[PDB]
Structure formats: C-alpha cells, structure tokens
Write a protein that binds this ligand. Structure first.
Ligand SMILES: CC(C)(COP(=O)(O)OP(=O)(O)OC[C@H]1O[C@@H](n2cnc3c(N)ncnc32)[C@H](O)[C@@H]1OP(=O)(O)O)[C@@H](O)C(=O)NCCC(=O)NCCSCC(=O)NCCc1c[nH]c2ccccc12
Length: 166
C-alpha cells in the first residue's frame, strides 16, 4: 500500500535499468566508462542475485553493490565478466551511491551490510574489489588491505587491488 522509506534488499534483473542509470553519472560522466553495462548487470543479477544489494528510498534505488564469485588469489581481466560458482571470493564488480544521496554514510552502511550478508554464505570466505588509489583508505575502514597494483586495465585508468578476510 506504500513505498518503504528505506529498504535493503538483493537485486533482480528488473533493477538492471536503475543500476546503469546511476553508473552513467557515477562513472561514465567521470572516466568515460563504467564497471558494468546493462547486459553485464543483468548477467550477474541473473546468475548470482544473492551477491547483490540495494538501498531503496521511497521506491528508488539510491545505492548498490553488484557481486559475483571469483576463485583465484588476484583479479584478472577475465574475472571482470565471470562468476565462478565454485569460488570462495565475493568479487565486488561495482559500488555506487546516487549523486543526490552521497556523503551521508550510505556507502559505508551498504558496504557493511554487504560484507555481513555474503560472509553469511557458506562459500564466501573473502571479499575483493579494485579501486582508484583515492579510495584505498576508505576501504581500509572495512578491513580491506591493499594488495598492490591491480592487473585489470580499464582505459587509461589503473586501480589498487584490495582484499578483505571474511
Ligand atoms: C564511494 C561511494 C560508494 C561512497 O558512498 P558515500 O558517498 O555515501 O560515502 P560515505 O558517506 O559513506 O562516507 C564518505 C567517505 O567516502 C570516501 N569518498 C567519497 N568520495 C570520494 C572521492 N572523490 N575521493 C576519495 N574518497 C572519497 C571518503 O573517504 C569519505 O570519507 P569522509 O567522510 O572523511 O569524507 C560514493 O561516493 C560513490 O558512489 N562515488 C561515485 C562512484 C565511485 O567512485 N565508486 C567506487 C569505486 S570503487 C569500487 C568499484 O565499483 N570499482 C569498479 C572499478 C571500475 C571499473 N570501471 C571503472 C570506471 C571508472 C572508475 C572505476 C571503475
């Protein structure tokens, strides 16, 4: 009968649309590329929805995490579009908060619930993601440790890989 003022839930391919939209502003408007395009978004939301998480305010996605499982110590170019069911690592492909909802602890909040959410799964024993050097201290507040230069290349952009024991 109404729109919950706040709701945290796993995503479904129905939210792919909304995810890309925030990606356009969050990444493309900046570097010219984005972590996941609509097909990639629907791909992981189809194969491993339980690895995603969204914050809906008044029926609108304001934050999201799109995961997938990895089975190697470090991230590679191929892992970018892969989901290793047999893996034990939660690979955070993308994390973003809406342009209008930033700097209000939402990213931090979503990130913590996410770590707790996937660490609840029997397989997931570690979390991994890549980020620009500017965000390394940010992810460290969550237990992530810088694991050196990430091998994944994206345009002219480089990233520092980070791992979090779960
Ligand atoms: C970061 C996040 C989710 C936090 O939310 P929030 O705004 O609500 O933040 P909080 O309120 O919870 O707390 C704020 C903290 O967030 C950190 N922070 C925020 N903006 C920062 C900045 N410009 N530089 C350094 N630290 C910053 C600070 O440390 C800051 O501390 P302070 O309270 O002391 O100020 C939110 O700001 C957001 O959605 N940003 C846009 C997308 C993005 O970059 N996603 C992450 C890429 S990392 C993960 C990822 O998706 N990788 C894919 C890698 C990738 C593939 N293709 C790309 C193309 C381009 C770029 C990257 C990629």
């Amino acid at each position: 009968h109404t729109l919950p003022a706040n709701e945290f839930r796993c995503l479904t391919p129905e939210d792919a649309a909304g995810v890309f939209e925030i990606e356009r502003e969050a990444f493309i408007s900046v570097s010219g590329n984005c972590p996941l395009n609509l097909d990639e978004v629907q791909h992981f939301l189809t194969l491993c929805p339980e690895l995603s998480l969204g914050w809906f305010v008044e029926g609108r996605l304001v934050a999201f995490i799109i995961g997938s499982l990895w089975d190697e110590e470090r991230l590679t170019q191929e892992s970018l579009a892969l989901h290793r069911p047999r893996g034990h690592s939660a690979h955070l492909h993308a994390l973003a908060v809406h342009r209008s909802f930033r700097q209000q602890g939402k990213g931090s909040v979503l990130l913590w619930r996410y770590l707790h959410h996937v660490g609840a799964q029997p397989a997931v024993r570690r979390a991994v993601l890549m980020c620009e050097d500017a965000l390394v201290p940010f992810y460290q507040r969550f237990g992530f440790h810088p694991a050196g230069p990430c091998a994944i290349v994206v345009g002219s952009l480089t990233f520092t890989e980070m791992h979090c024991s779960l």
